[PDB]
Write a protein that binds this ligand. Structure first.
Ligand SMILES: *[C@@H]1O[C@H](CO)[C@@H](O)[C@H](O)[C@H]1NC(C)=O
Ligand SMILES: *[C@@H]1O[C@H](CO)[C@@H](O)[C@H](O)[C@H]1NC(C)=O
Ligand SMILES: *[C@@H]1O[C@H](CO)[C@@H](O)[C@H](O)[C@H]1NC(C)=O
Ligand SMILES: *[C@@H]1O[C@H](CO)[C@@H](O)[C@H](O)[C@H]1NC(C)=O
Ligand SMILES: *[C@@H]1O[C@H](CO)[C@@H](O)[C@H](O)[C@H]1NC(C)=O
Ligand SMILES: *[C@@H]1O[C@H](CO)[C@@H](O)[C@H](O)[C@H]1NC(C)=O
Ligand SMILES: *[C@@H]1O[C@H](CO)[C@@H](O)[C@H](O)[C@H]1NC(C)=O
Ligand SMILES: *[C@@H]1O[C@H](CO)[C@@H](O)[C@H](O)[C@H]1NC(C)=O
Ligand SMILES: *[C@@H]1O[C@H](CO)[C@@H](O)[C@H](O)[C@H]1NC(C)=O
Lengths: 208, 217, 345
């Protein structure tokens, strides 16, 4: 019946900066909208009930406003505790969510590459890891090369949560392939793209 | 603002069922607010499942669940239970119990939350991880590859907790095999590589697996 | 000029002081006689806002009926958490009588006379009275009995029709008789409730048609309760002091919207000795039924529904599902007190 169009899908902003996410409804819903905050790994937390009512234990910078069909949540001066996902709720219907984090000066990733252990090769499998350390924004593009042959569909990557102190992300990408398949090539590289990089960076090793 | 208390994480084969419990009041201390159950699948939006009225067991289940879900409460009406039958892999999620604050009107403003109950639906068997070294090549990085375990979670400490200043333990990823992997990497100056031992301590409680891997150049 | 306010109301009735029937006994000491000639004044050009879902009158009636029950009913045993109270459980005379609720000096009751008023919003035809009409405190689930009937069309009432946590009172504009009986001398607990299927399905049809108006135009479907205590999952009520539980499955048959659907519908009913107390927490045990024919002919004047939850597939489903509900007895009172609010002068 009801549809909650929340936006933007994502946004970034500097400390002490004003952030406003908005929710729209396919129909008029009076004040029957609630806002939540969900930090990574934790249960959601109610911020604003019935569109405008702030809840006890919720910093003043947090404000909910709206009525009828148009609603929004606002954080006066954005703080580092406020990094999380925020979604609206209309009874059992939830908005799409807005991921918000700290906007810092674009930063290049400190890159490192790791061959597979010899212990792993005995298993008949080989994992090649490519580490990206302390960069921003979260966006990036790691693509594996085996003898200058881009690999795709055999890699899995994993990012951390934005560090609190420095406000950076770090990313681990694993290229997996069989023991026998690994021994067929020599040059193994991580091709990396990012705002903080003037040119796509390569980090490689020669098998053995 | 009090957190409700939910039962521990659960693992299930497809076709099976699980029951999550949620203690929402003390037995010993306005119609009561209903207990709501929801779940959030990994990297997904929260999904409402049902409410249960602890006063008379009245219930409302999300229609698309097709009668697969059942909610009840104990005799004292201090604890709610959610039963999910005919589990499929995509029932894998964290299950939450939630409830509105008692001095509020909206049944839907979830002020109180359980800490959540991870439910993993998979046909993979319990398995301890193998831990392979990530040998470091001014500042060098080194880590551990925690490979092929089930189910989550594993916890990773460096030097029996000693050092954390420069540790990036990444979220586990699910491989096509149905098993998990994660990496834990550590930043350190180069000078140190030949003076101080670096052991990553890996514990996977579900398989009762402990390991102490020394990472050397 | 006046303003909304809440004050302690008093009840009035035509109770008989010499009766041993428990409602009469209660009302005799807890109410005053009915006003032999009550005045009602119509307010030419007034328009006032009501909210049947936020009406302190409902709270007061609840207090009163709970009180009537706690001192009228005599279970052999009451159990409440860690309390076990045994006592004598003589059978009682039991038949609800009409109670009127009245304001004290300085206050007046405003009454909405809009035929299709749904319980909340502006009301054009307002008047003032000193008391409500006579309201029988009938405690029942799923079906509302011996109540008053909507004036023109069947009316749907909810605090929020799109909120699945909200009970939906359906107000009939024509009553359907329900005739429940535990025959004399089979198990003494076994009873049945008979209902003219023809009349009932005509009404239940007109109901779905009215629900259609509130949900774009999705096909309406009924189902048995998804769960809960028996007082909820069955049509529950008291007759001559006995607690009936009638299975209403056959009452909400969607097919009857052709062959066999007409004709008398017999509902299997059970008289229970062990019950859950609606007044609050605990169980009560009563003695087995009295002897002889036990019979209660009632008017169905309303239904309590619950709508099935779940909007996730933005498009999702093509039909709505409703299940007989109740269990919050305040809803029974709202069912009757909806057109009244207290105002201070
Ligand atoms: C619920 O009802 C109120 C008035 O009683 C109304 O303002 C609001 O729009 C309704 N909520 C929804 C979800 O339609
Ligand atoms: C009753 O009528 C009012 C008129 O203002 C309307 O706003 C409200 O939604 C209606 N209630 C229901 C649930 O039909
Ligand atoms: C009852 O209500 C329906 C509309 O909801 C109407 O069509 C029908 O004629 C009414 N019946 C009576 C007897 O007023
Ligand atoms: C109610 O049903 C009983 C038992 O079938 C019957 O004796 C009695 O005549 C019925 N009463 C009415 C009003 O139809
Ligand atoms: C049942 O209801 C119909 C419709 O009002 C009526 O014609 C009939 O007399 C009633 N009795 C029986 C036995 O169907
Ligand atoms: C909706 O349903 C009503 C009643 O069945 C019908 O008369 C009408 O054609 C439909 N159109 C709308 C959108 O109300
Ligand atoms: C009522 O009767 C039906 C059909 O016999 C049965 O399936 C259902 O379980 C019963 N409902 C209750 C609440 O016992
Ligand atoms: C429901 O509909 C069927 C099909 O016409 C009918 O034969 C049956 O008696 C009904 N059952 C109930 C639950 O009343
Ligand atoms: C409804 O009223 C009738 C007539 O006064 C009475 O015989 C019957 O017992 C009442 N029903 C209930 C459930 O109180």
């Amino acid at each position: 019946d009801i549809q909650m169009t929340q936006s933007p899908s994502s946004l970034s902003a500097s400390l002490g900066d004003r952030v406003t996410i908005t929710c729209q409804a396919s129909r008029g819903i009076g004040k029957d909208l609630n806002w939540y905050q969900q930090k990574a790994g934790k249960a959601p937390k109610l911020l604003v009930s019935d569109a405008s009512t702030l809840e006890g234990g919720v910093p003043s910078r947090f404000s909910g406003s709206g009525f009828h069909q148009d609603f929004s949540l606002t954080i006066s001066s954005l703080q580092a505790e406020d990094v999380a996902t925020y979604f609206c709720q209309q009874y059992e219907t939830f908005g799409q969510g807005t991921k918000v984090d700290i906007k810092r000066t674009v930063a290049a990733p400190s890159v490192f590459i790791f061959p597979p252990s010899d212990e792993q090769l005995k298993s008949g499998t080989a994992s090649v890891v490519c580490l990206l350390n302390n960069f921003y924004p979260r966006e990036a593009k790691v693509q594996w090369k085996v003898d200058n042959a881009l690999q795709s569909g055999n890699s899995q990557e994993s990012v951390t949560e934005q560090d609190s102190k420095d406000s950076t992300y770090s990313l681990s990408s694993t290229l997996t392939l069989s023991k026998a398949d690994y021994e067929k090539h020599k040059v193994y590289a991580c091709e990396v793209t990012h705002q903080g990089l003037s040119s796509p960076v390569t980090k490689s090793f020669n098998r053995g | 603002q009090v957190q409700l208390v939910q039962s521990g994480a659960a693992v299930r084969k497809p076709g099976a069922s699980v029951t999550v419990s949620c203690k929402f009041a003390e037995d010993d201390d306005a119609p009561e607010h209903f207990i709501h159950f929801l779940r959030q699948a990994p990297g997904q939006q929260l999904e409402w499942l049902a409410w249960m009225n602890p006063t008379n067991g009245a219930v409302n289940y999300a229609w698309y669940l097709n009668g697969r879900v059942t909610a009840t409460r104990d005799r004292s009406m201090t604890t709610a239970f959610l039963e999910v039958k005919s589990l499929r892999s995509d029932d894998t999620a964290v299950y939450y119990c939630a409830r509105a604050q008692k001095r509020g009107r909206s049944e839907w403003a979830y002020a109180h939350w359980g800490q959540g109950t991870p439910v993993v639906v998979s046909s993979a068997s319990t398995k301890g991880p193998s831990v392979f070294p990530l040998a470091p090549s001014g500042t060098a990085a080194l880590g551990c590859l925690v490979k092929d375990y089930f189910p989550e979670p594993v916890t990773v400490s460096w030097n029996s907790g000693a050092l954390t200043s420069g540790v990036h333990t990444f979220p586990a990823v699910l491989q096509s095999s149905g098993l998990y992997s994660l990496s834990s990497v550590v930043t350190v100056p180069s000078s140190s590589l030949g003076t101080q031992t670096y052991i990553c301590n890996v514990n996977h409680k579900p398989s009762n697996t402990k390991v102490d891997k020394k990472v050397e150049p | 000029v006046w303003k909304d306010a809440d004050t302690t109301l008093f009840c009035a009735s035509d109770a008989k002081a010499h009766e041993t029937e428990v409602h009469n006994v209660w009302a005799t000491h807890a109410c005053v006689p009915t006003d032999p000639n009550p005045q009602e004044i119509h307010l030419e050009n007034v328009t006032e806002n009501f909210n049947m879902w936020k009406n302190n009158m409902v709270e007061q009636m609840q207090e009163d009926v709970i009180s009537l029950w706690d001192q009228s009913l005599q279970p052999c045993v009451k159990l409440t958490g860690g309390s076990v109270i045994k006592q004598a459980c003589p059978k009682i005379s039991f038949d609800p009588i009409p109670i009127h609720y009245c304001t004290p000096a300085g206050y007046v009751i405003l009454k909405c006379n809009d035929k299709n008023f749904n319980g909340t919003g502006p009301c054009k035809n307002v008047s003032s009275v000193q008391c409500t009409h006579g309201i029988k405190p009938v405690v029942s689930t799923q079906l509302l009995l011996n109540g008053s009937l909507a004036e023109e069309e069947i009316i749907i009432r909810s605090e929020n029709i799109s909120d699945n946590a909200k009970t939906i009172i359906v107000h009939l504009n024509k009553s359907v008789e329900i005739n429940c009986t535990r025959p004399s001398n089979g198990d003494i607990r076994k009873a049945y409730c008979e209902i003219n299927g023809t009349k009932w399905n005509k009404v239940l049809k007109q109901v779905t048609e009215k629900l259609k108006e509130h949900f774009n135009n999705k096909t309406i479907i009924f189902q048995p309760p998804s769960g809960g205590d028996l007082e909820i999952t069955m049509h529950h009520f008291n007759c001559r002091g006995e607690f009936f539980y009638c299975n209403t499955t056959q009452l909400f048959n969607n097919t009857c919207i052709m062959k066999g659907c007409n004709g008398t519908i017999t509902l299997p009913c059970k008289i229970k000795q062990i019950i859950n107390m609606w007044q609050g927490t605990g169980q009560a045990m009563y003695a087995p039924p009295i002897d002889g024919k036990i019979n209660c002919v009632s008017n169905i004047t309303g239904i309590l529904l619950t709508r099935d939850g779940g909007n996730t597939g933005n498009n999702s489903r093509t039909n709505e599902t409703f299940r007989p509900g109740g269990g919050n007895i305040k809803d029974n009172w709202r069912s009757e007190l909806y057109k009244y609010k207290v105002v201070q002068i």
